[PDB]
Amino acid sequence: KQFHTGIEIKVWAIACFAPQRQCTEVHLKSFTEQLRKISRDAGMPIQGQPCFCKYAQGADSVEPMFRHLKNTYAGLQLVVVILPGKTPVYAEVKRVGDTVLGMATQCVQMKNVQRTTPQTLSNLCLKINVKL
Amino acid sequence: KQFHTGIEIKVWAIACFAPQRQCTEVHLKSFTEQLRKISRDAGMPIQGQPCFCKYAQGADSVEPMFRHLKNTYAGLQLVVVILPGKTPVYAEVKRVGDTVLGMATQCVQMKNVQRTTPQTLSNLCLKINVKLG
Amino acid sequence: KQFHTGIEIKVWAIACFAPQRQCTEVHLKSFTEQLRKISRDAGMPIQGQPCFCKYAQGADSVEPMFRHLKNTYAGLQLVVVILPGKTPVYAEVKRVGDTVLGMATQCVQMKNVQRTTPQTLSNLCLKINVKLGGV
Numbered sequence A: 001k002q003f004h005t006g007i008e009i010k011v012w013a014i015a016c017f018a019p020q021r022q023c024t025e026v027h028l029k030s031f032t033e034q035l036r037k038i039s040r041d042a043g044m045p046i047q048g049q050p051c052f053c054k055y056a057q058g059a060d061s062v063e064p065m066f067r068h069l070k071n072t073y074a075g076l077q078l079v080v081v082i083l084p085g086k087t088p089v090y091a092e093v094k095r096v097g098d099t100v101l102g103m104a105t106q107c108v109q110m111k112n113v114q115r116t117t118p119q120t121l122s123n124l125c126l127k128i129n130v131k132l
Numbered sequence B: 001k002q003f004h005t006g007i008e009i010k011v012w013a014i015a016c017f018a019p020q021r022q023c024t025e026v027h028l029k030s031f032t033e034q035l036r037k038i039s040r041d042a043g044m045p046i047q048g049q050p051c052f053c054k055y056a057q058g059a060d061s062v063e064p065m066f067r068h069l070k071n072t073y074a075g076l077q078l079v080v081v082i083l084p085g086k087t088p089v090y091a092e093v094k095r096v097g098d099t100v101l102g103m104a105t106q107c108v109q110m111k112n113v114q115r116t117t118p119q120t121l122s123n124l125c126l127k128i129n130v131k132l133g
Numbered sequence C: 001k002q003f004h005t006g007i008e009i010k011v012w013a014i015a016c017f018a019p020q021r022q023c024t025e026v027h028l029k030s031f032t033e034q035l036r037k038i039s040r041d042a043g044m045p046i047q048g049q050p051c052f053c054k055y056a057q058g059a060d061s062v063e064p065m066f067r068h069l070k071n072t073y074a075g076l077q078l079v080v081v082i083l084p085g086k087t088p089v090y091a092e093v094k095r096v097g098d099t100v101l102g103m104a105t106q107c108v109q110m111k112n113v114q115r116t117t118p119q120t121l122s123n124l125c126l127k128i129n130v131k132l133g134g135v
């Protein structure tokens, strides 16, 4: 895991499986902007707003939503998935992204979106950097 | 460029990502016959019926279908991919064919399958000729 | 036919255009070591680990990567290029290596990296040997 310098993330999406009442739109947009800033400092810029950002409920929504993403957004590079703690959703994310569709997926715990820290944003960058 | 003489396309497939309701079997068979004729006349004959011809929908279908093709038809030379206009399918077809599986692919817009003209068939032949030549 | 004696391959690189998911690090390291062994037995020893070993994707990556290689690794003798099969990358590799930069490049199919046999390693040795011998 030597860090890669050449990465640019142009097309990406957010799928929020945490409840909106806990993880609101402002929490998500705040999170997005802070993630963009750190990714820029590290020389793996996330350009742009996500091309898609929706709430969803249930592990069974993962495959349909990811197929939808792949089928709708040309060149989609990354899906960031927000999770409400321990969940069957995580398992469903992993199999679909890593073994079915071959698309980079990164999960994040809702609590790190509600109150973001540079350390957790850094962790997410490093993981994305490895994946991409 | 230079056109290449002496190419023969013996094993080829059609993957149609345009909806069947717009691009029916008879449209595809008619298209195939016209392509056969012009390619023969130009001395790069696309010989025979395709070894495979199936509909699919979505960029997500590309990799599974092409893995199937690669694994089932040894000596597959070409996949002709019919596209429904602007689509994430094109990008995925190029990624899978050129990078993932290593398979020659030529895309064609559905509107040129629904009504063929000599000029669009010629375009397609020349592209195939360059790719396989 | 005409195998060349007395060649030593000291500076060489691997550029893998097959996806990592298909052609993993262990596949590449295993392939490298097997290639070194047979090439040593045949008297064209690969003296070291490659100076560079990276994944890349797309014909558009070829020229930049090869320029990097040429400019960074003095006396680079060989680039081994792993390809998934028929691909516009093959054409671009030949154009850039043979006409743009002038460095010896040898392509190999991903399936022969994933699982080696003595016969396919031998094939690749002979081709490397031919390209490197000369004035």
Ligand SMILES: Cc1cn([C@@H]2OC[C@H](OP(=O)(O)OP(=O)(O)OP(=O)(O)O)[C@H]2O)c(=O)[nH]c1=O
Residues within 6 Å of the ligand: A083, A085, A086, A087, A090, A094, A098, A105, A106, A107, A108, A109, A127
């Ligand atoms: C089991 C479980 C785990 N997590 C954590 O969230 C992502 C983080 O790490 P990750 O898996 O993303 O780490 P990674 O090495 O990049 O590998 P994968 O993401 O491909 O699995 C993981 O530790 C949850 O939030 N909920 C859960 O229920």
Ligand SMILES: Cc1cn([C@@H]2OC[C@H](OP(=O)(O)OP(=O)(O)OP(=O)(O)O)[C@H]2O)c(=O)[nH]c1=O
Residues within 6 Å of the ligand: B083, B085, B086, B087, B090, B091, B105, B106, B107, B108, B109, B127
């Ligand atoms: C860039 C782009 C192009 N097209 C056009 O539709 C078929 C035609 O095919 P093309 O002659 O380009 O040949 P192709 O097999 O697409 O591949 P190349 O070998 O030219 O790269 C291509 O120009 C799309 O439908 N979507 C796109 O996003």
Ligand SMILES: Cc1cn([C@@H]2OC[C@H](OP(=O)(O)OP(=O)(O)OP(=O)(O)O)[C@H]2O)c(=O)[nH]c1=O
Residues within 6 Å of the ligand: C083, C084, C085, C086, C087, C090, C094, C105, C106, C107, C108, C109, C127
């Ligand atoms: C489909 C495919 C096949 N092969 C075969 O494997 C050895 C030999 O090698 P190739 O003649 O293709 O290429 P090469 O030695 O670098 O030769 P030159 O182009 O310098 O003559 C070629 O017959 C590839 O290597 N790459 C492929 O993708």
